[PDB]
Each structure stands twice: as structure tokens, then as C-alpha cells.
Design an enzyme around this catalytic site. Structure first.
Site, PDB file in Angstrom:
ATOM      1  CG  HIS A  49      -0.475   0.360   2.496  1.00 17.42           C
ATOM      2  ND1 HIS A  49      -0.293  -0.588   3.474  1.00 17.42           N
ATOM      3  CD2 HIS A  49      -0.087   1.539   3.040  1.00 17.42           C
ATOM      4  CE1 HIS A  49       0.221  -0.016   4.552  1.00 17.42           C
ATOM      5  NE2 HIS A  49       0.356   1.274   4.313  1.00 17.42           N
TER       6      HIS A  49
ATOM      7  CG  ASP B 148      -0.011  -3.934   2.709  1.00 13.82           C
ATOM      8  OD1 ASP B 148       0.433  -3.412   1.660  1.00 13.82           O
ATOM      9  OD2 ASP B 148      -0.538  -3.252   3.615  1.00 13.82           O
TER      10      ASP B 148
ATOM     11  N   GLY C  23       2.787   7.139   8.538  1.00 16.26           N
ATOM     12  CA  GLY C  23       4.104   7.261   7.945  1.00 16.26           C
ATOM     13  C   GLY C  23       5.097   6.286   8.517  1.00 16.26           C
TER      14      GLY C  23
ATOM     15  CB  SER D  13       2.906   1.394   7.138  1.00 21.84           C
ATOM     16  OG  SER D  13       2.903   2.363   6.105  1.00 21.84           O
TER      17      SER D  13
HETATM   18  C1  LIG Z   1      -2.684  -8.266   4.930  1.00 21.28           C
HETATM   19  C2  LIG Z   1      -4.108  -7.836   4.858  1.00 21.28           C
HETATM   20  C3  LIG Z   1      -4.665  -7.812   3.438  1.00 21.28           C
HETATM   21  N1  LIG Z   1      -6.171  -7.804   3.510  1.00 21.28           N
HETATM   22  C4  LIG Z   1      -6.857  -9.115   3.801  1.00 21.28           C
HETATM   23  C5  LIG Z   1      -8.342  -8.883   4.059  1.00 21.28           C
HETATM   24  C6  LIG Z   1      -6.599 -10.066   2.641  1.00 21.28           C
HETATM   25  C7  LIG Z   1      -7.198  -9.568   1.359  1.00 21.28           C
HETATM   26  N2  LIG Z   1      -7.747 -10.486   0.573  1.00 21.28           N
HETATM   27  O1  LIG Z   1      -7.179  -8.390   1.088  1.00 21.28           O
HETATM   28  C8  LIG Z   1      -4.127  -6.650   2.633  1.00 21.28           C
HETATM   29  C9  LIG Z   1      -3.321  -6.883   1.535  1.00 21.28           C
HETATM   30  C10 LIG Z   1      -2.822  -5.831   0.807  1.00 21.28           C
HETATM   31  C11 LIG Z   1      -3.128  -4.538   1.168  1.00 21.28           C
HETATM   32 CL1  LIG Z   1      -2.490  -3.245   0.219  1.00 21.28          CL
HETATM   33  C12 LIG Z   1      -3.943  -4.287   2.252  1.00 21.28           C
HETATM   34  O2  LIG Z   1      -4.239  -3.009   2.632  1.00 21.28           O
HETATM   35  C13 LIG Z   1      -5.043  -2.169   1.900  1.00 21.28           C
HETATM   36  C14 LIG Z   1      -5.074  -0.814   2.209  1.00 21.28           C
HETATM   37  C15 LIG Z   1      -5.885   0.035   1.496  1.00 21.28           C
HETATM   38  C16 LIG Z   1      -6.658  -0.456   0.473  1.00 21.28           C
HETATM   39  C17 LIG Z   1      -6.625  -1.805   0.160  1.00 21.28           C
HETATM   40  C18 LIG Z   1      -5.825  -2.658   0.872  1.00 21.28           C
HETATM   41  C19 LIG Z   1      -4.422  -5.330   2.977  1.00 21.28           C
HETATM   42  F1  LIG Z   1      -5.203  -5.079   4.037  1.00 21.28           F
END
Ligand SMILES: CC[C@@H]([NH2+][C@@H](C)CC(N)=O)c1ccc(Cl)c(Oc2ccccc2)c1F
Ligand SMILES: CC[C@@H]([NH2+][C@@H](C)CC(N)=O)c1ccc(Cl)c(Oc2ccccc2)c1F
Lengths: 642, 645
Positions: free
Chosen positions: B71, B95, B151, B153
Site C-alpha cells: 500500500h 501487503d 508514515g 508503516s
Molecule cells: C494483509 C491484509 C490484506 N487484507 C486481507 C483482508 C486479505 C485480502 N484479501 O485483502 C491486505 C493486503 C494488501 C493490502 Cl495493500 C492491504 O491493505 C489495503 C489498504 C488500502 C486499500 C486496500 C488494501 C491489505 F489489508
């Protein structure tokens, strides 16, 4: 850095399209060099700093925009940085000589009631004029629609300029009107001088006048000048925001001009029956303001100061002076609104690097820079002062922290020392230092009309303005070669203060000086209306209305929060009273609410929240009547910066 | 643009864990390095303070890999000594992204011992204590305003011995305050390194003997929806092909009958045929309207355009993923030309030309020459209905045959046939299947995003944002199909692909209630199957929250719902619901935008303040917060909510 032109709205019935001419890289280089070789076209320019982007409208051969965006900055030009031609901080208006290729709008003569606002996105929004500086949007639009458009033209049907847009008038987050600077305020600005000399005290006038004195500390603005006046036979009151400076004038005047004056601070009072008196703004307000007949001249020193006591104090003078028989108020400062920091002969300036044994705000301080001598290191918070004093002591540098709360005796006045302090230093201690090292940031408060449910007071770390930087650097170089080291070379515009400072003035009024909100308004009304003082948005009706509903506060809570010296002792106490009455716990158990700690066993359920003064950990209910009143108050017209 | 290192956080050597920051670059240096991808400044320290043009955050080298969050960094390259370093791992599901650690960069080492007292380092060099609650969660010993953590992360979570437990990726909030932190476990960084760095998905999978979900990452041109289903059918399998567009679905079927031989089943609102063949083409909406998978029907289910984050598509793929093994399918294929983490690479048919200020037609701050759009067939992508009609207006007056197209207008208003300039929004892409001699792209789009603004509840804000890699690719994909093509653009930028907003989760529950008779509980099951399937677009997990909100919205007025449904606007359930509550208190709607046209007829009998449930746009009327549904929604805002930092 300089303001940069990054595009233009071309005007042509009235329609427009916009054109971008630079990207981030270009904007950054151009702002640094001050050199812009691009050809300027059009009457409206899209401009930008490293922070905000906004507009500028050329009228009568001057390119104009708002002080809140441009500050006192130069504009990048073909030969180099262009210094501003006009700077009217009182009207939120600045202006540079129009560069070649710029067309000028000519002023609207006839004056239609029908007006069109050109926005940065090239929209043409209809507006019905309601007054000199006020128009209503035919279609109420969200506030964020107008953001980036400060400095854009309002036009009559024929296309002549009626003024430039300066602020949205919000009702609960939606823009229903617009504040603009009239074209006649621009023509007035073009007829005032660019050089009014304020470096000499005025002679006393036959009847009442407010006058401005601009000259550095040491020059005897506070010592020699009141003496000169006393010699001519006048009674003079000198107001100052520091207890330490006020007291130090006592033994200074005695030695230097054989006048043993009256001194009036909270901690100490001396009446000698001298014709000269030195008092804090705070003690002045505690004593009820101006006593009938007691003074001829009132000199308000450090009138650049924008703490609540000074503001409330200065506006009391301005409301009362003439009726108490004053003939002269003098507003004195070395750093008036619109000032920038110019080089100082006695002060060498040296950016800090990464080479140093001691980390400091991402840069470094070498041990050799502070091992010998007396040195002043400014930090933004007490926490960081404690950290730096600890490190320095642990390397065997004699170091000492100072901030609000401590006794000044932590001092040490003679001998080697590194003093690590917040800006509290500038009020509790009057001494000078061999070097000053400046983090170039301060902590400030900002009000946020967040409607969740009412308003919030955010505490935020921000870049320092031109007054902070100058006041901090001026703790070295006072009759002896000083060094000034810094983390960063820029500075925000000077002379603006936030709406939370206004809120703070009602609070202190109620808490500390027995003033009704109606009474507080009148004294703030006198301050706002006087030219050349610091500026803020006019949110008086609003804060008056808010504090007007806060009745039957609990004496014990008020006293306790006054004695802890919190910010907003009245708002905190008032929320505490509501909680203890409603039998409900406070927003959180932060130190802020310690005043309620012995009721913790019996207080349960959701907090009747009135406003937000920090993190709110507990559940909240909006049902309390005071909450509903403060909610209702948020329907008032709020000027917002756009 | 590349990610630039602009500073570091030096951790202590011994005793208690403490740290300080060092800043090594200003803004000007940061932009130049990002645009050149070149960084000769050496790299000390294990925790780097990194920035992009638009933002800044942290990265923590562990085991020779400088790791950060997706992200923050997207798929971007890291500015390095001999130019931009490409990412070695891009784990969008976790992420988590990673570059090879540059010359003499130092690396933390993993939590060998395994303790449960943790310490988070932030970009300010503060050192917050944290208590490990789970594999990837930890509570703050002193809760904090979520802004404190912005900031940071990418930043490390340390055990007392100085070893890296994980990297910070999100605050878990309750009503604005961070009670906890989510991090990427260090063992997710080892699951990541213990795998192929390159995985293949270019070829349709072989049909497994038992249920498997595969990805087909292949160009719209490889015949994702014609050739590959024909081929499976040729080998005796029953195949269902799902697709977001009614136009694309009908086109594939018509193509299949004329080209690859057979007359397939078609399933759309506007047209349905049961031929009894073994290929069925359907839309996600018809598939859901039909109640999803009916057992035995299909061996293979191809989810085409699986990158799409409209609500129907997500709700669709989620259903297939919950239901397909139990309905007897052997294979679910998730097809797309543009999967999560993908970048726009150059195309050999397509010449890419930056617009300049030279030209007669203004276009989003740059300019288009009429020369470039008189010679033939062209497509102009614009962000709004408004700009579309405005730019048809200008172009046609200048002697051009221009026509607008967006949601509501009818396809085929585009001549078939003629010599044309079609000015369109993204609605083009699901409405109409033709391509053009050149595409002109504004490189921005309208999207919706949710604000947990507690004023009293949440706010769905429509905004214009820069386009992402998927948007740029699909828009550009409408030229250079076989013949030569030209792509002209306003901005070169590109946001990371593959991420969608919590507001899209909102639309899923909304659509489930308005269109598909799915209780919120049933919708959550389907969405869960989506989140848990790897290689799909990612979101924050706000499922409990949204389920809990929609579970309170009972007894909607059928009549209003049917109007908000037919009017085609977003969030028909939330709009109908607020109007329902407004009509039963004889109160006005929040304003008289077109959003609220269902209540115009009652205008003269509606009075007083609006009982506001939530904000779906400007609120002009006075509001009361005493309605039981507002209170129920306020209680819902106490859910634990992941938010990024
Ligand atoms: C590691 C958590 C993952 N989310 C889970 C529910 C799995 C999934 N299927 O999304 C996740 C992965 C990647 C990103 Cl960029 C994540 O954070 C964001 C932040 C803002 C918008 C979209 C995702 C994330 F929250
Ligand atoms: C033109 C109005 C003036 N305010 C009046 C109440 C006069 C006064 N005494 O301030 C004004 C001048 C300059 C500026 Cl930067 C103004 O706007 C802001 C915005 C934010 C903070 C401070 C001032 C302004 F509001």
C-alpha cells in the site's frame, strides 16, 4: 523558496479553460532559484508554494493574491526573485508587479449584483453580492470544491474584476457564501506608501491615537522611550507578556534613568508612586483593565505576541484607553505581521549537517559546538528537551532543560551550560547566549470544526513562522558575536493566528478574569479592528455563542484545572462538571481529567461529549442538553481558509 | 517514479531499545533521485525512511531484503547506486514487497526466541511498547491517536533482544484511537522467500483431477474468453464463462457460434438462450440473480476480468469461490490481463505520445491538436458525464462528429461504421467492444471512498484520483489491437494496481440487499471466500463492520428501493433507506440533489430536520441524531477497524 507560476486560467458571456505549464520538479527548482523564464500569459495565474497551490489575478498592472497563501514571499521571475510591491496583511492581500505577457482585468465600475467566481478548475460559479466583501453562491456547494481557489477573480457580467476570492463562508461543512477582497481595497493599497518609517516613537498627540513602533529589542523601545516620555511629564504604562522582563525593568530603570517604577506581576507587586509602571498583560487584566485617569501613554510591548493573554490584554487597552483619558497607545514590536527574517550583522548562520555526535531533528550537533560556553537549544516539546538534556549530561556536558512548569532557577545564570528549552524560555528567562541552535518547528493548537459532534482542538507540530525564527535567533547576538545553527532554512508567514487562540481568550476570560463572553467579544472586537496587528478569521460570534451556554460550572473543578495549568481550564472544567452531574465518566483518564479521579468508582456509562480536547476513549452519548446547544451553535456562519 | 531512501532510523546497540532518526535528503534531491532511479549515497542502518512523490514511510531490511508495505510502495523500483532496483518479491496478499538490500545495507534478524513484549519503531524514532495478541496482532499498552502512527508503516516490531518480529502495516482503531497494530509476521517474509521468485500463469491450466483455483494472466487477445473455453469444451468439459459486461458476454457467444463452431448458452438480463451446449456464457449479475451455482452443471468456471472491483464482479467471484467445489466443479480459473501488482509495460502496436500545451482543444490542463483527431476513429477518456458533454460540444462545433457515452446513454449512439470521435467515461469498457485508431487518456477517474468521520457515523465521498496500472492498461487496450495504434496522455504516472476501498465492500452488502436477496450474513460468507483467495484484488477487512451496519437497516420501503434500483445510481439501498426513514418522520432528505429525487413528490409535506443516518453527499438541511437507526449505526462505529498508516 519563491511562489511559482504553474499554470493559467484563460478567460474569454464568460467561460474559461485552464492550462498547466509545470510539474513538481520544475516548481521545486524554480522556487529555489527564483528564476522563471517561462512566458506568462493570461490575467489569472495558477501559482504554488511547496505547500499550498492557489491563484493570482492580475489587475491594474499588479498581480494579486492572498497573504495566507503567498505570505511575504518573492515571486519567481525572468531576471530573478521578484520582491512584493504591496503587502496588506490586514486585508489578506499581497501583490507583485505584473510580468510581461500578463493581461490585466480592469476594475468593475458599474457594479452588478450578479457576479461570477472563476475557480482553479476553470468553473464559472454565479454569485449574488450581499455587501462590500460578501456574496452568496446561487448553488450551495461543498467547501472542498473551492479549495485551491484563493486569489481567483470575481467578475461582473462584462468581465471586469469586482474583487479576488479569499474565504468560504461555511454552514455545517457546506459553502453558501464567499468572502472576497474588493477591487477598491486594491486601489487603496496602491495609494498607500511602500515605506512608512515606524522606527521612532511618535510625539504625544493633542487627542487619542494608536501608533506603531518597529525596532529591535535592546534599542530602548521599553526603557529609554518610556523615560523620554516621563521627562516630558507624562504617566506611562508599559505592558509586556513576560514576568521576567517586567521585573527586570525595575532594577534597570533605577540604575539607568533614576526612575524607581511601579511593577505589577502576579508573583510580585511594587507601588512606588512613580510616573512609570511596568505590568504583565495578565496582571493588567486581573486589575480590571484601564483605571480612569491613571495613564497618558500606554505602550503595548511585544504586540507581535499571539498568546491569549496578550491579545485579550491589547484589546482591553484599545477598548478602554480613550475613555480612561489616554492620548496615545503605542503598539511596539521588532517583528510586525508581514516581517521576514533578514540577515543580522552580529549573527553568523550555519546550517547543521549530519556530521555530529549528537542527533537533532534528523541532523547533528558536534560536541565541539557546545562543549565550551553558554548555549541555547530550542526543541518543540518538553519530552524532547528531557531527552536532549539527558544525553548531553551523560556525555558530561553541563545541561539543563527548561519548559512551562519548571522554576527558572534551573537557570544557571553564570558559567558553562547548555539550556534545552521550549518557547516558554522566551517568557521565563531574559538572558542571552553564545549560540542558539533551533529545531525550526513549534507545537501549536488548531481548531477543527469536525461536527463529531461539535469541534476539536488538535495539538500539532508545525514549521516555525518568521516571528518564532527571529525571536529564537535573537537570544544570541545581543551586543556580542553570536552563532545561530538550524535544521532548516524556510519560514511560514508571520502575523496569523488560529481560531483556537480566540477560543483560548474566552476560556481565560471566564476562567481567570471574570469576563462574560459578551465582554470578551468587545475587547477582541477592538483588537481585530485595529490595523497592523496580527490577524485571524472572524469567529467571535461563534465562540461567544459557545461559551454563553456553559453555565453553573463547578467551582472546585475550575479551581483545580486552573491550578494544574492545563490549556483551556474552563472547557476542561466545564466538561468535568457535566460528567459529574450526569454521573458519567470523562472522555478518557488522561491527566487532562485528573480533576475527576476520586469519582471513578461511581462514574459509569457513555460520556456526554461537548467537544473534543484530546483522544476520546469512552463511548459517547449526544443526548445531554449542553451538547445539543453546542451542536446548534455549529450552524453559525464560519469563515474558512480556502 | 522510483521509491527514494531519504533517511534512516538508527537503533541502539545495547541495553534498552531506543533509536534516533537521520535525514539524508531534501525534497529536491528526493524528486530527482525518484525520476532518475539513481542513488549514489551509501546506505547505512537497517530501517530506512523512504518516500515517493506523493508520500513517505519506512522500510526494514531483514535477511538481505529491504521490505516495505505494498500500500506504500506498490510495485515501484527502489532508487539505487547503478540505477533503479526492481522488486524481488511482490506479495500483494500480505501487503509485503521487497528489494535486494543494496551495498552494505544492514539487516535485522528474526525473532529466534519468540517473546510477547514487543516494541514498534516509528518514523519519528519513538519506541512504543506493544503486547502480542496473535500471530499478526498486538495491543498498544497506552492507546494513541491513529495520526501518531502515520508514515510508520514498514517499520519494525522488535522483541527485547533487538530481533524483528514483523513490520508495521496498519492501525486497528476504535472511534479514532489506536488500541492495536497489525503487522506482517517475519515468517510471512520467509514463506515469501521460500518459493519461486517467478511463477507462471501465462497458459490455461490443465484440468486437475480435484478442485483447484488457478490464475490465467494473459493479454485480451490471447482469447481468454473464446479460445480457452472452446479448447476445454473440445476435450469434453462443461464450462461456464463469467464476465462483468453484457456487451462482452453476447459478443463472445456470437463469436463462438460463427468462429469456434458451436451455439453456446447465453445468460443476461436482456437475452437468455438454453441451447443445451456445454459452454455457457453469463454475466456476474445474471449468475447471482440465478442464485449462483446449481450443482452438477459445470466442470470449469472461468471468472473473466477478475481484476474488476465493481460490486457485482466481487460478489460474483466470491459466490463461485464459496460454492464451486460443493457444486462439483474441478476448476475455477481467474482470468485477467492485469492482475494485482501488474505494471503498464510498453505495447509493440502502440505509440505512446505525451500531450503538450500546443493545441486547439484544452484537455485537463494540457491540449489536443485537431489534426490528431480528424483523421479517423478515436476514443477520448474523460472522468465525468459533464466533461464528456462539454467536450462533445466543443469538438463538433470545430467540425467533428463527436458523441458522448457514459452510464445511462445507449450504446450504438457510437456509430459503427462512421468516422468518429467518441468521448467516454470508463462505462465505455463494459458497454461497447470496439477499438479505435487512437486513445486519448486524461489519466484520472472518479472513485468513492469511505471516511469513518463519526459525524455521526461514516461518509461516502466521491473524488477524482489518478488512474492505476489497470485503468491505464484497459483504456490504452482499446487501440493497437492487430493494427497499429496511438496512445496520447496527460500524465505518465500510475498508482499501484489491485487495491480497492472499504466503500466497495459497502456496495457489496448494498447490492446483496437491493438486488440478490442476500442477507448480510450470506454476503459476508461470499466476501470472505474472496478475501481468503490469494491473487485477487485486496482490501482492508471491514466485513464484520459493514455486515453489522446493514443488519440494522430493516423494513425498507419496497417502493423507494425499486426507484433507487431503476435510477441506476450507487448505493440504492443506503439511498432508499435514508429516504425511507425520512418519509416515515415526514422529514426532508439531507438535500435536494438528484440522489433524493424519490422524495420530490412529497416535498410539500416534509418538514423539520433530517434524521441523518450517514453522509452520502452534502447535507444542507439541519439534522437530528435521535433516530434509533442513527444510534444503532453509531454503536456500530465501535467495531475494531483496520486503517492504513
Ligand atoms: C494483509 C491484509 C490484506 N487484507 C486481507 C483482508 C486479505 C485480502 N484479501 O485483502 C491486505 C493486503 C494488501 C493490502 Cl495493500 C492491504 O491493505 C489495503 C489498504 C488500502 C486499500 C486496500 C488494501 C491489505 F489489508
Ligand atoms: C480580511 C479579513 C482579515 N480578518 C479580520 C477579522 C481582520 C483582522 N483583524 O484579522 C484577515 C486578514 C488576513 C488573513 Cl491571512 C485572514 O485570514 C486568516 C486565515 C487563517 C488564519 C489567520 C488569518 C483574515 F481573515
Amino acid at each position: 523558496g519563491s511562489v511559482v507560476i504553474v499554470g493559467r486560467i484563460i478567460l474569454s458571456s464568460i467561460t474559461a479553460y485552464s492550462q498547466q505549464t509545470r510539474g513538481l520538479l520544475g516548481c521545486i527548482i524554480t522556487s529555489l532559484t527564483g528564476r522563471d523564464k517561462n512566458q506568462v500569459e493570461g490575467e489569472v495565474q495558477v501559482v504554488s508554494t511547496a505547500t499550498q497551490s492557489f491563484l493570482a489575478t492580475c489587475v491594474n498592472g499588479v498581480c494579486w493574491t492572498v497573504y495566507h497563501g503567498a505570505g511575504s514571499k518573492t515571486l519567481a521571475g525572468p531576471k530573478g526573485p521578484i520582491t512584493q510591491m504591496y503587502t496588506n496583511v490586514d486585508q489578506d492581500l499581497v501583490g507583485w508587479q505584473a510580468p510581461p505577457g500578463a493581461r490585466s482585468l480592469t476594475p468593475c465600475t458599474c457594479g452588478s449584483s450578479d457576479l461570477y467566481l472563476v475557480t482553479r478548475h476553470a468553473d464559472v460559479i454565479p454569485v449574488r453580492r450581499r455587501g462590500d466583501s460578501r456574496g452568496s453562491l446561487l448553488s450551495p456547494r461543498p467547501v472542498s470544491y473551492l479549495k485551491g481557489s484563493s486569489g481567483g477573480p470575481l467578475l461582473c457580467p462584462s468581465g471586469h474584476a469586482v474583487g479576488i476570492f479569499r474565504a468560504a463562508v461555511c454552514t455545517r461543512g457546506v459553502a453558501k457564501a464567499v468572502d472576497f477582497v474588493p477591487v477598491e481595497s486594491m486601489e487603496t493599497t496602491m495609494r498607500s506608501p511602500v515605506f512608512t518609517d515606524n522606527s521612532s516613537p511618535p510625539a504625544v498627540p493633542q487627542s487619542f491615537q494608536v501608533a506603531h513602533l518597529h525596532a529591535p529589542t535592546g534599542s530602548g523601545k521599553s526603557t529609554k522611550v518610556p523615560a523620554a516620555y516621563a521627562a516630558q511629564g507624562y504617566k506611562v504604562l508599559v505592558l509586556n507578556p513576560s514576568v521576567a522582563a517586567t521585573l527586570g525593568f525595575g532594577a534597570y530603570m533605577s540604575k539607568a534613568h533614576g526612575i524607581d517604577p511601579n511593577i505589577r506581576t502576579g508573583v510580585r507587586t511594587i507601588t512606588t508612586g512613580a510616573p512609570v509602571t511596568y505590568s504583565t498583560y495578565g496582571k493588567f487584566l486581573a486589575d480590571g483593565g484601564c483605571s480612569g485617569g491613571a495613564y497618558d501613554i500606554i505602550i503595548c510591548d511585544e504586540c507581535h505576541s499571539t498568546d491569549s493573554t496578550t491579545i485579550l490584554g491589547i484589546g482591553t487597552v484599545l477598548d478602554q484607553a480613550e475613555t480612561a483619558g489616554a492620548r496615545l497607545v503605542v503598539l511596539a514590536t521588532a517583528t510586525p505581521p508581514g516581517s521576514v527574517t533578514v540577515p543580522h550583522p552580529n549573527i553568523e548562520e550555519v546550517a547543521l549537517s549530519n556530521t555530529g555526535e549528537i542527533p537533532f531533528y534528523g541532523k547533528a550537533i558536534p560536541i565541539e559546538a557546545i562543549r565550551g560556553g553558554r548555549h541555547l537549544i530550542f526543541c518543540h516539546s518538553k519530552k524532547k528537551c528531557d531527552e536532549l538534556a539527558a544525553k548531553l549530561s551523560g556525555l558530561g556536558i553541563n545541561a539543563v532543560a527548561y519548559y512551562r512548569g519548571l522554576d527558572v532557577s534551573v537557570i544557571p545564570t553564570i558559567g558553562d551550560v547548555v539550556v534545552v528549552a521550549t518557547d516558554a524560555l522566551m517568557t521565563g528567562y531574559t538572558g542571552d547566549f553564545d549560540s542558539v541552535i533551533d529545531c525550526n518547528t513549534c507545537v501549536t493548537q488548531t481548531v477543527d470544526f469536525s461536527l463529531d459532534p461539535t469541534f476539536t482542538i488538535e495539538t500539532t507540530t508545525v514549521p516555525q513562522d518568521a516571528v518564532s525564527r527571529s525571536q529564537r535567533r535573537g537570544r544570541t547576538g545581543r551586543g556580542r558575536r553570536g552563532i545561530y545553527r538550524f535544521v532548516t532554512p524556510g519560514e511560514r508567514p508571520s502575523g496569523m493566528f488560529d481560531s483556537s487562540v480566540l477560543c483560548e481568550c474566552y476560556d481565560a476570560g471566564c476562567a481567570w478574569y471574570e469576563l462574560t463572553p459578551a465582554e470578551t467579544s468587545v475587547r477582541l472586537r477592538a483588537y481585530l479592528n485595529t490595523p497592523g496587528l496580527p490577524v485571524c478569521q472572524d469567529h467571535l460570534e461563534f465562540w461567544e455563542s459557545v461559551f454563553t451556554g456553559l453555565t453553573h460550572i463547578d467551582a472546585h473543578f475550575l479551581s483545580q484545572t486552573k491550578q494544574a495549568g492545563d490549556n483551556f481550564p474552563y472547557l476542561v472544567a466545564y466538561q468535568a462538571t457535566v460528567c459529574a452531574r450526569a454521573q458519567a465518566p470523562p472522555p478518557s483518564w488522561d491527566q487532562m481529567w485528573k480533576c475527576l479521579i476520586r469519582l471513578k468508582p461511581t462514574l459509569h456509562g457513555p460520556t456526554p461529549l461537548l467537544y473534543r480536547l484530546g483522544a476520546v476513549q469512552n463511548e459517547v452519548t449526544l443526548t445531554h442538553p449542553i451538547t445539543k446547544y453546542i451542536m446548534a451553535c455549529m450552524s453559525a456562519d464560519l469563515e474558512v481558509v480556502t
